[PDB]
UniProtKB/Swiss-Prot annotation, chain A:
Belongs to the RNA polymerase beta' chain family. DNA-dependent RNA polymerase catalyzes the transcription of DNA into RNA using the four ribonucleoside triphosphates as substrates. It comes from Thermus thermophilus (strain ATCC 27634 / DSM 579 / HB8). This is DNA-directed RNA polymerase subunit beta'. The RNAP catalytic core consists of 2 alpha, 1 beta, 1 beta' and 1 omega subunit. When a sigma factor is associated with the core the holoenzyme is formed, which can initiate transcription. The lineage of its organism: Bacteria, Thermotogati, Deinococcota, Deinococci, Thermales. It comes from the Bacteria.
From Swiss-Prot, chain C:
Belongs to the RNA polymerase subunit omega family. It is an enzyme of class 2 (transferase). It comes from the Bacteria. Keywords: DNA-directed RNA polymerase, Nucleotidyltransferase, Transcription, Transferase. The lineage of its organism: Bacteria, Thermotogati, Deinococcota, Deinococci, Thermales. Promotes RNA polymerase assembly. Latches the N- and C-terminal regions of the beta' subunit thereby facilitating its interaction with the beta and alpha subunits. InterPro entries: DNA-dir_RNA_pol_omega, Pol_omega/Rpo6/RPB6, RPB6/omega-like_sf. SUPFAM superfamilies: RPB6/omega subunit-like. This is DNA-directed RNA polymerase subunit omega. Disulfide bonds: none annotated. It catalyses: RNA(n) + a ribonucleoside 5'-triphosphate = RNA(n+1) + diphosphate. Pfam families: RNA_pol_Rpb6.
From Swiss-Prot, chains D, F:
Homodimer. The RNAP catalytic core consists of 2 alpha, 1 beta, 1 beta' and 1 omega subunit. When a sigma factor is associated with the core the holoenzyme is formed, which can initiate transcription. The gene is rpoA. Residues 1-229 are annotated as: Alpha N-terminal domain (alpha-NTD). One of its GO terms (biological process) is DNA-templated transcription. Its EC number is 2.7.7.6. The keyword Nucleotide-binding does not apply. It comes from the Bacteria. Belongs to the RNA polymerase alpha chain family. This is DNA-directed RNA polymerase subunit alpha. The chain holds residues 1 to 229 of 315 of the full protein. GO terms for molecular function: DNA binding; DNA-directed RNA polymerase activity; protein dimerization activity. The N-terminal domain is essential for RNAP assembly and basal transcription, whereas the C-terminal domain is involved in interaction with transcriptional regulators and with upstream promoter elements. It comes from Thermus thermophilus (strain ATCC 27634 / DSM 579 / HB8). GO terms for cellular component: cytoplasm; DNA-directed RNA polymerase complex. DNA-dependent RNA polymerase catalyzes the transcription of DNA into RNA using the four ribonucleoside triphosphates as substrates.
From Swiss-Prot, chain E:
It is an enzyme of class 2 (transferase). Keywords: DNA-directed RNA polymerase, Nucleotidyltransferase, Transcription, Transferase. The gene is rpoB. Belongs to the RNA polymerase beta chain family. It catalyses: RNA(n) + a ribonucleoside 5'-triphosphate = RNA(n+1) + diphosphate. Transmembrane segments: none annotated. Disulfide bonds: none annotated. One of its GO terms (molecular function) is DNA-directed RNA polymerase activity. It comes from Thermus thermophilus (strain ATCC 27634 / DSM 579 / HB8). Its EC number is 2.7.7.6. This is DNA-directed RNA polymerase subunit beta. GO terms for cellular component: DNA-directed RNA polymerase complex. The lineage of its organism: Bacteria, Thermotogati, Deinococcota, Deinococci, Thermales. The RNAP catalytic core consists of 2 alpha, 1 beta, 1 beta' and 1 omega subunit. When a sigma factor is associated with the core the holoenzyme is formed, which can initiate transcription.
């Protein structure tokens, strides 16, 4: 009753994320914040 | 048992587009109950869920506002439809519901071919994709209007079925009426005038066998495209009539209907010239020409754009069919005048066989096998006879066109109505000595009937068997083949198979070009293992050979440049559990390369299980 | 059929990938607030009882309508798994 | 008004240029979109009387199947190009107008080359009649009339000059008509006719104009049911 | 072997009485052995029908006998064959055993006969299962009839002769599925046994001996015989057939009428005038419509519903029991514990519903009250009750309701209480309550109709008389049948029926075309000829001639080759009519349909709607106890099966989730389906 | 007027009773008899209003599937015969008229047996309702309304008396339409359309009346092409 090995259930794509250029700059801003003092 | 399921009788949905399907609102309501409940709360119809529930617990209590809610919940969602035997992956297809009144389920006509479903009471089930994911896949890779080409063959499956062809065919056919006096206008100017007046008279038809132009061409010439049809509308030219017309840069001698078909496609897809390049207006559109058209349009213009063409054809085919007024009368089934001849000639010949046995020449057996040989030949004779009749005298015989056009009818079938069904076998298998002299047009006698009955049962008894033998098979195949799935990077093991374009033994030994089909089967959408330079073009290595390429190699083998072809294949793959992109090929239900993650194992096991239902079934071993 | 399905197919390396993208985009479109979109102003999603599709009919019909444009980015590993959900809650209201 | 009468055919229009014009009109009761679209169509094509080249006379040419020296095009191709010509006269006084044109030598003959006539106008000036080489002599008289529908050159057989040749009659500023009847859902009942008809026009008149004329002809004909006998 | 009578209509109830099966005792023929038995053996002649047996696995093993087939002394079907001594044929008949049949040279009935004289030297006969052209001097025995060769059920087919034995089977089984209409009609063309069928079946009520009629009630016809006696003949008003089809005897005799012995006093469920009648001969055009008739779809004229044409009365019998629980007797009372009197209206009688009340899905048919828990009360429900009204009847609403699908108006009810008269009440069963409901079923888009030939199909669209195909004189077609369905299948007989039909329409007459001896192509062309005069003759006199339309279609017709070029339209149309086709205009456009189209009076029946038909649809519902998969029953529909073949279908697609769903959230995921629902909510 | 306008549709009529009415009208141009006859037909069948039995109440009968003693016919047969009844009221003031009839014993019940109502008339007197034997008691109230088209008894569900039973609505007073377009020869040109349409009516309205209503619906619809958008 597990997901099928074949299809959208491919190790090749089970993992894929999406982004908006807005959320792209927002995450890099989190990286910028990493600079201490 | 699925929780969000349903099932009703199905019914043809002519206006419906491949995209959608007609679903009884009454069904939709229960199906999408929870989706509705909540949506009721988002609107003023109900305060809460439990409320919204009791609100619908009785039929008389529903405010018309609820329908507007459900109709809103189903906006872009889609459902799955199933058929009785799910034989292949298309056995289930996704569509956008368009809610409708009543009990029946409106189904599209084009997909009636994928699911083997006719409307003599067939019933389809219906399921619902709940997750946003299940929906995503469902409407992306499971929706009908996307899977147009079969996984078995790169041939379309959205082919204009029965009625559509029948329509599209009748419109594009040309007529020929009476040849009495001279047919020579190619040369004299007195020929144009005399046979133009003689036609005005009663002697020359508008469509006479007169090489260059029958007077039907002489009389009417049409400047622009439209001009042509307008005359038709006014009752000047029928659609099936032979006339001359000016198109883009040519004076083309083609019929009204043909010219119109041209537009239909030209319109379906606005790249007009591209519409002309992939169409053959030199012939009546049979299912094959159409089939072809579809395929071409698919590779050429793009998937969705094809879909449009599909319904475009669907629509006009349907319409034109109605007006064509094709019907079925008893007299339309025409029996040849030659039937009596062929019969009697073979009749007396039977007498000789008898005299030859009465004397002691032919053994008990020799007699038998000689008689049957008489009929088997005589019967096939009447067959090509009836056709010739129609081919020559009634080109537009109802019963005929349907069979010519990809529409409906089998040569062997026609034979039984117009000509005669001649030999039926005894219970065991030994064919009967006496034939069935009758046709269905005339009274199949009390006994020639009984005689033919035997053979009927065996066919039915056989059909009853593949209903499950078909499974016997697919089962086994899927037991061994399920694990097989496309999961890769070009498998680096280049060990390849060579496809033969020639066969050693039809007649003992003579090398010959394989049938365009088999070869197609072998190299369509494959991946070249090694590079091959053939007629002038350099097929590179690893290139996926399109049907156009596999059309080249053949043309090349015809010339004598190649006897084999290097090509990757599953038989030589390295991925232990699985097969790769380059070794599988093209054919996803789509025509490009295979997409990683396709369940090939089964796709395969299925394509092979279905047709199995058509193969004979006497004894396994 | 559906809008530029070919165009879409072409934008991915694998058919089955396009399905995952759209589905995950549709997911986020609803969870973080449905205004998490990249193309609303002039010509956008629309339904006709009114022109109200502008608010919440079909999630993925949107996802696809954006993906067809070149503003979104789908990668195998574009932005670290847990920091994504955090930055998205921070910037998109509507709950 | 508010209930049944306010629920009235919303006549909506969409027209670009003078050639194409879409026209939508809903709601309509049961099977009325058809009841209307069809007649209008039949009218839009036959009835919107128009103009078309009814006869031609090349001076040295006798039959229609001849070819003129210095002239690339053949008689049959030119008589064909003339069917393409769209003219427009302003008043009834003009029933049959003979347009004249004569051009010689290395010149291209276009419709603008016809000598202007007082109450007549040529909307098809740049249309191409022929390509004359050298020593190219073409002097003709092309008849023009006001009629309705399609009339084969055989049916009329016009006789201005004995060596002239009749042409087929394309009497209509309308090119093609097309109407669709798709369902529309209005609250209570779903069964609804929505009639939208698409009209194309050579430019002489406009889709809208055409349509108006059409409906009137119908109206005018519906009045002919007055005096019993 | 003993089974429910199949009275979907008398014919059905009869065939079901006379069919012969294989399986059974087991000791005569189990499930394994097949194909040699299942095949139509040579001897099956006049003893068993070769068509009758049902489709599906159980094929050929179960089949009804033939016309003249009779079980002599010990179960040996003897088919009758008449004697022919020398070149002389007799009216004497011998019911022969399978075996002895082989010792003789037998001939067919089609043999030209002068009386006792055979007429052609080389005439067909068949020794032993072998077709043999024998001489008149060898012809020892002759076939009795065309009828004996098949079964009753089959004999009812018009021109059986022109229809593929294969599809003729469908035709025979279709009749067994004929539902009685409140407007029965005999076929415009019959074979000859319709009479005998209704008669030998016990549909219509016949007169014993001559006399006159006394009273003609809607419920009884007390006839007076000339013998000085008079008897009251009740008529099963409205009775419930096992399968829910109405069985009423409508009196056809007026008051004070001298009756011939054996004449119909009343008509049976489906008889018009002593003749079998199912469905109704309807004028039909046989051409393609948009797609409304695409593979096997049928387009119907709204007009057919205007007149109560295909309309039938059904009756389902809902039943509920007052059970004795140890928790307390389930009372049947007008009391419905939790919410409204609105729903109690038609529950007029305290408890039962009032007769003649229109019941819709979800209305109480009967009320009953059982106890709330298994053994203990409820702590949480304890608080709530106390909050707004502690003193509350702790009884549970378990009341027979109208199951989805439909109900009509209640017509009869039955209640059996404590002091039983002479009835058998099961144990624990305190009392029972029957509710007979009736409902009119006017034909609609979901229904399926089919002619005797085998053309089976469903209504896809009911068109407004406004625009369907109309003939020159204002009369329009009722149904439009797709042509394509005819070539493939091979039953020209329907096409033959329609032609004779057209004739009977204008000639206002019905005919009887026997099995293989019936009407002949020339005879029909002859009647068509007569019809042209009724059609077109009145047209001439009424004042008008031919249309531009009519002429136009003629042009295209000669170009076709259906009419001899050069003859007058009037003459041409006669030719064209004789061919069985006439000119038809669109109706939507008024233009003609390029090319003549046949039309005519074809008989078509309406088929019974099974329970499955009732389009099911389940959202959520019960679940099996041991297996946790969805289960239905009484009012919740029960889920659909997702079979392996279906799994693969998805597997093949990249439907990963969609397949998981089908395996988890939708059927077995206990914790899954729950959170599922809620989540959706 | 004298030339083209005097040469005008000679509207001729032939009507017997209120059921049949033939209507000829010629001359007409090319293919117009069809252009007109067909729409009118479409209208004459769908569009026009009439009368039909909308509800019934037998006094002792509760549901439609019952049978009345002393009465040969069954409820369902009788309600069926009533649909056959054609009534005719004279003015708008009569929207819903309830006709009453009660007959006892050995008499045949025909439509004439209904008690007369001031502004209403029964054109179907001799129609057969029932055959009563002895002790035959039939007392009923049959509603009658003015509507359009077909309305299933299910759709309206009329409620005069709680034990009453609704009937199906057969509101087109038009039975059948039929039109022919035969050639007529007027002097000069032979191609001429002659349109004659035959109309049949249940009696409620008259052929002529119907026709008039028809043409108007058409006209009213041709006006709906006024305001562009
Ligand atoms: Mg089927
Ligand atoms: Zn590989």
């Amino acid at each position: 009753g597990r997901l099928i090995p074949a299809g959208t259930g491919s190790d090749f794509v089970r993992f894929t994320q999406v982004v908006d250029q807005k959320t792209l700059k927002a995450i890099e801003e989190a990286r910028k914040e990493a600079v201490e003092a | 048992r699925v929780d969000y399921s349903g099932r009703s009788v199905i019914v043809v949905g002519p206006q419906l587009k491949l995209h959608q399907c007609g679903l009884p609102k009454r069904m939709a309501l229960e199906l999408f109950k929870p989706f509705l409940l909540k949506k009721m709360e988002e609107k003023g119809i109900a305060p809460n869920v439990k409320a919204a529930r009791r609100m619908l617990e009785r039929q008389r209590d529903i405010k018309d506002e609820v329908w507007d809610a459900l109709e809103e919940v189903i906006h872009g969602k889609v459902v799955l439809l199933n058929r009785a035997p799910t034989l292949h992956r298309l056995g289930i297809q996704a569509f956008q519901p368009v809610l409708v009144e009543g009990q029946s389920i409106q189904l599209h006509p084009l997909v009636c071919e994928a699911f083997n479903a006719d409307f003599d009471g067939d019933q389809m089930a219906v399921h619902v994709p709940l997750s946003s994911f299940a929906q995503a896949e469902a409407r992306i890779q499971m929706l009908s209007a996307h899977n147009l080409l079969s996984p078995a063959s790169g041939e379309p499956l959205a082919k204009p079925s029965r009625d559509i062809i029948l329509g599209l065919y009748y419109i594009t056919q040309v007529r020929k009426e009476k040849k009495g006096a001279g047919l020579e206008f190619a040369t004299p100017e007195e020929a144009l005038a005399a046979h133009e007046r003689g036609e005005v008279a009663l002697n020359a038809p508008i469509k006479v066998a007169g090489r260059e132009t029958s007077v039907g061409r002489l009389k009417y010439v049409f400047a622009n495209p439209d001009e042509a049809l307008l005359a038709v509308a006014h009752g000047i030219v029928d659609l099936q009539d032979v006339v001359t017309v000016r198109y883009m840069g040519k004076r083309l001698e083609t019929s009204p209907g043909r010219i119109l078909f041209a537009r239909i496609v030209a319109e379906a897809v606005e790249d007009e010239k591209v519409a002309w390049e992939l169409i053959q207006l030199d012939v009546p559109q049979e299912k094959n020409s159409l089939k072809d058209l579809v395929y071409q349009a698919f590779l050429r213009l793009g998937m969705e754009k094809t879909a449009r063409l599909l319904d475009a054809l669907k629509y006009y085919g349907f319409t034109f069919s109605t007006t064509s007024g094709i019907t079925i009368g008893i007299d339309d089934a025409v029996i040849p005048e030659e039937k009596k001849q062929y019969l009697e000639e073979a009749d007396r010949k039977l007498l000789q066989i008898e005299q030859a046995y009465e004397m002691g020449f032919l053994t008990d057996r020799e007699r038998y096998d000689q008689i049957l040989q008489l009929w088997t030949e005589t019967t096939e004779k009447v067959t090509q006879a009836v056709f010739k009749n129609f081919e020559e005298n009634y080109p537009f015989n109802p019963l005929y066109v349907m069979a010519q056009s990809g529409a409906r009818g089998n040569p062997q079938q026609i034979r039984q109505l117009c000509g005669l069904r001649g030999l039926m076998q005894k219970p065991s298998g030994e064919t009967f000595e006496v034939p069935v002299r009758s046709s269905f047009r005339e009274g199949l006698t009390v006994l020639e009937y009984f005689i033919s009955s035997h053979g009927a049962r065996k066919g039915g008894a056989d059909t009853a068997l593949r209903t499950a033998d078909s499974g016997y098979l697919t089962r086994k195949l899927v037991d061994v083949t399920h694990e097989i799935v496309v999961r890769e990077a070009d498998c680096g093991t280049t060990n390849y198979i060579s496809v033969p374009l020639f066969q050693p033994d039809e007649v003992t030994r003579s090398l010959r070009l394989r049938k365009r089909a088999d070869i197609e089967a072998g190299l369509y959408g494959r991946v070249l293992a090694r590079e091959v330079e053939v007629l002038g073009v350099r097929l590179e290595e690893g290139r996926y050979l399109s049907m156009d390429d596999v059309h080249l190699l053949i043309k090349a083998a015809e010339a004598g440049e190649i006897q084999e072809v290097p090509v990757r294949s599953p038989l030589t793959c390295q991925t232990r559990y699985g097969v790769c992109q380059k070794c599988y090929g093209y054919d996803l239900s789509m025509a490009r390369p295979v997409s990683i993650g396709e369940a090939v194992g089964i796709v395969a096991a299925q394509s092979i299980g279905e047709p199995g239902t058509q193969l004979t079934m006497r004894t396994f071993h | 059929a559906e809008p530029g399905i070919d165009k879409l197919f072409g934008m991915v390396d694998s058919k089955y990938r396009l399905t995952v993208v759209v589905a995950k985009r549709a997911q986020q479109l609803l969870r973080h607030g449905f205004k998490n979109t990249v193309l609303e102003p002039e010509e956008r999603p629309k339904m006709q009882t009114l022109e109200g599709l502008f608010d919440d009919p079909n999630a993925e019909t949107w996802a696809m309508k954006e993906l067809l444009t070149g503003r979104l980015v789908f990668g195998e590993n574009l932005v670290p798994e847990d920091r994504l959900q955090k930055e998205m809650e921070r910037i998109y209201p509507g709950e | 008004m508010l209930d049944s009468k306010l629920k009235a055919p919303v006549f909506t229009v969409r027209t670009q240029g003078r050639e194409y014009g879409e026209f939508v009109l809903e709601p309509l009761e049961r099977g009325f979109g058809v009841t209307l679209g069809n007649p209008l169509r039949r009218i839009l094509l036959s009835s919107i009387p128009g103009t078309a080249v009814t006869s031609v006379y090349i001076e040295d040419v006798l039959h229609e199947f001849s070819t003129i020296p210095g002239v690339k095009e053949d008689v049959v191709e030119i008589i064909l190009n003339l069917k393409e010509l769209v003219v427009r006269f302003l008043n009834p006084s003009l029933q049959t107008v003979t347009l004249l044109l004569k051009a010689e030598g290395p010149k291209e003959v276009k419709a603008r080359d016809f000598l202007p006539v007082a109450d007549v106008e040529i909307m098809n000036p740049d249309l191409h009649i022929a390509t004359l080489e050298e020593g190219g002599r073409l002097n003709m008289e092309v008849r023009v009339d006001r009629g309705v529908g399609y009339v084969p050159a055989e049916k009329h057989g016009i006789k201005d000059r004995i060596n002239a040749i009749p042409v087929d009659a394309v009497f209509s500023p309308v090119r093609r008509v097309a109407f669709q009847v798709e369902d529309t859902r209005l609250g209570q009942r779903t069964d609804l006719d929505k009639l939208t008809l698409r009209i194309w026009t050579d430019g002489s008149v406009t889709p809208l104009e055409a349509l108006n004329q059409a409906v009137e002809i119908l109206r005018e004909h519906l009045t002919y049911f007055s005096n019993p006998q | 072997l003993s089974q429910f009578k199949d009275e979907t209509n008398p014919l059905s109830s009869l065939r079901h009485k006379r069919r012969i099966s294989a399986l059974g005792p087991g000791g005569l023929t189990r499930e394994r052995a097949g194909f040699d038995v299942r095949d139509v053996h040579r001897t099956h002649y006049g003893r068993i029908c070769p068509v009758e047996t049902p489709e599906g696995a159980n094929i050929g093993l179960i089949t009804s006998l033939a016309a003249y087939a009779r079980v002599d002394e010990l179960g040996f079907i003897r088919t009758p064959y008449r004697r022919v001594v020398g070149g002389v044929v007799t009216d004497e008949v011998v019911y022969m055993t399978a075996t002895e049949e082989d010792r003789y040279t037998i001939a067919q009935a089609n043999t030209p006969l002068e009386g006792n004289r055979i007429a052609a030297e080389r005439v067909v006969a068949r020794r032993k299962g072998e077709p043999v052209i024998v001489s008149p001097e060898e012809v020892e025995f002759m076939d009795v009839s065309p009828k004996q060769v098949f079964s009753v059920n089959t004999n009812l087919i018009p021109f059986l002769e022109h229809d593929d034995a294969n599809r003729a089977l469908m035709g025979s089984n279709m009749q067994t599925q004929a539902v009685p209409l409140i407007r029965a009609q005999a076929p415009v063309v019959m074979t000859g046994l319709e009479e005998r069928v209704v008669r030998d079946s016990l549909a219509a009520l016949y007169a014993e001996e001559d006399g006159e009629v006394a009273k003609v009630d809607g419920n009884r016809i007390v006839v007076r015989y000339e013998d000085g006696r008079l008897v009251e003949y009740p008529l099963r008003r409205f009775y419930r057939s096992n399968q829910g089809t109405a069985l009423d005897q409508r009196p056809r005799v007026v008051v004070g009428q001298r009756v011939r012995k054996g004449d119909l006093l009343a008509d049976g469920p489906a008889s018009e005038n002593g003749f079998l009648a199912l469905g109704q001969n309807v004028l039909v055009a046989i051409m393609p419509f948009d797609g409304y008739n695409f593979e096997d779809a049928i387009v119907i004229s709204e007009e057919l519903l205007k007149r109560d044409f295909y309309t039938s009365i059904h009756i389902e019998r809902y039943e509920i029991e007052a059970r004795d629980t140890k928790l307390g007797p389930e009372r049947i009372t007008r009391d419905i514990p939790h919410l409204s009197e609105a729903a109690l209206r038609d529950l007029d009688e305290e408890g039962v519903v009032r007769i003649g009340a229109e019941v819709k899905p979800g209305d109480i048919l009967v009320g009953r009250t059982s106890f709330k828990g298994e053994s203990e009360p409820t702590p949480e429900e304890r608080l709530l009750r106390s909050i707004f009204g502690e003193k509350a009847r702790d009884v549970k609403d378990t009341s027979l309701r109208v199951p989805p699908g439909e109900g009509g108006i209640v017509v009869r009810t039955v209640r059996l209480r404590r002091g039983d008269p002479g009835v058998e009440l099961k144990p624990g069963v305190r009392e029972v309550v029957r509710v007979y409901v009736a409902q009119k079923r006017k034909l609609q888009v979901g229904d399926k109709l089919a002619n005797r030939h085998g053309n089976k199909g469903v209504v896809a669209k009911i068109l407004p008389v406004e625009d369907m195909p109309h003939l020159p004189d204002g009369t329009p077609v009722d149904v439009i049948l797709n042509p394509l369905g005819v070539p493939s299948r091979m039953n020209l007989g329907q096409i033959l029926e329609t032609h004779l039909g057209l004739a009977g329409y204008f000639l206002g007459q019905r005919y009887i075309s026997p099995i293989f001896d019936g009407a002949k192509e020339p005879e029909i062309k002859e009647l068509l000829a007569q019809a042209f005069e009724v059609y077109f003759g009145k047209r001439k006199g009424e004042g008008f001639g031919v249309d531009k339309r009519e002429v136009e279609v003629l042009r295209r017709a000669e170009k076709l080759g259906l009419v001899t070029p050069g003859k007058t339209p009037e003459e041409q149309l006669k030719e064209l009519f004789l061919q069985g086709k006439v000119v038809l205009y669109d109706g939507r456009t008024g233009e003609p349909i390029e090319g003549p189209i046949v039309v005519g009076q074809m008989f078509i029946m309406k088929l019974y709607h099974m329970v499955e038909d009732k389009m099911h649809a389940r959202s959520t519902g019960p679940y099996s106890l041991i297996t946790q998969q969805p289960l239905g029953g009484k009012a919740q529909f029960g889920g659909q099966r997702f079979g392996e073949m279906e799994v693969w279908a998805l597997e093949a697609y990249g439907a990963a989730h969609t397949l998981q769903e089908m395996l988890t959230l939708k059927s077995d995921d206990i914790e899954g389906r729950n959170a599922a629902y809620e989540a959706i909510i």
